[PDB]
Design a protein around this ligand. Structure first.
Ligand SMILES: NC(=O)Nc1sc(-c2ccccc2)cc1C(=O)N[C@H]1CCCNC1
Length: 263
């Protein structure tokens, strides 16, 4: 309560499942901080805090701290004044290829970082990728994040949490699966949306005709026909159904378009 004495909760920045994100500005210094408010009596809030404590990287939203007031949790986060990546994507169009390439490089740096410390995000999508005042990408919203590697010993995951058009096909087919290829797949869906302004399917299942179309290499249909051959060839390696055959991030960093000078 003494916080709201000195800090103005200026307005709502977004709505999550358990509550809102508010912009807080200090009436004296004018410093701005984002306040995620979560109702424990309604994403896993205990783990979110716990995972946020581990993170220190230029492409992850910085966590300052938290507190509990009754049943309500408050997370204090760096304010990313550039907003969601989602709002840089023009519906049915996307954004310029150089912008998409730069964002994707920054997505990869943030994802390499998380996986390096054995964390998987599990909900990668444009709504969970924020931009700072220099348009640097910041991975956000760790409510579905979990540890997949303990020191140097991996475990397989089994939770089908995640936003369905971004979910890898193994989540609908296998009872357990490796963490890292799931994150690589959602990144591919993000790249597709950036380049075309359009998600390719509701869900990566056999019954979905748009998924069948992609499996059958019908790249003359939307969204694929709007995408240049070079970035498309990377997408061909990422949106690979068998997660064991799917491109890894060290191999993404060798891809021709990935390394292509544009503009
Ligand atoms: N740390 C932050 O600054 N968070 C921000 S800034 C912002 C913002 C900043 C400038 C303009 C518009 C929005 C939106 C969000 C935010 O967290 N929104 C969530 C909502 C649920 C889906 N994930 C994103």
């Amino acid at each position: 309560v003494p916080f709201v004495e000195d800090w103005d909760l200026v307005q709502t920045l977004g709505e999550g499942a358990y509550g809102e994100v508010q912009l807080a500005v200090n009436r004296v210094t004018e410093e701005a901080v984002a306040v995620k408010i979560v109702d424990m009596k309604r994403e896993n809030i205990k783990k979110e805090i716990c995972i946020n404590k581990m993170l220190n990287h230029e492409n992850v939203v910085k966590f300052y701290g938290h507190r509990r007031e009754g049943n309500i949790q408050y997370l204090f986060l760096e304010y990313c004044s550039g907003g969601e990546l989602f709002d840089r994507i023009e519906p049915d169009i996307g954004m310029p290829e150089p912008d998409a390439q730069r964002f994707f490089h920054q997505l990869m740096a943030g994802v390499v970082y998380l996986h390096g410390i054995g964390i998987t995000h599990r909900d990668i999508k444009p709504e969970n990728l924020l931009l700072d005042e220099r348009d640097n990408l910041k991975i956000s919203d760790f409510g579905l994040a979990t540890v997949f590697r303990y020191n140097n010993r991996e475990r397989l995951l089994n939770k089908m949490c995640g936003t369905l058009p971004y979910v890898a096909p193994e989540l609908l087919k296998r009872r357990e699966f490796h963490a890292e290829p799931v994150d690589v797949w959602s990144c591919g869906i993000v790249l597709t949306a950036m380049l075309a302004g359009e998600l390719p399917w509701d869900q990566p299942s056999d019954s979905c005709q748009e998924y069948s179309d992609w499996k059958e290499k019908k790249t003359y249909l939307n969204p694929w026909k709007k995408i240049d051959s070079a970035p498309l060839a990377l997408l061909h390696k990422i949106l690979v159904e068998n997660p064991s055959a799917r491109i890894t991030i060290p191999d993404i960093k060798k891809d021709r378009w990935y390394n292509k000078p544009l503009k």
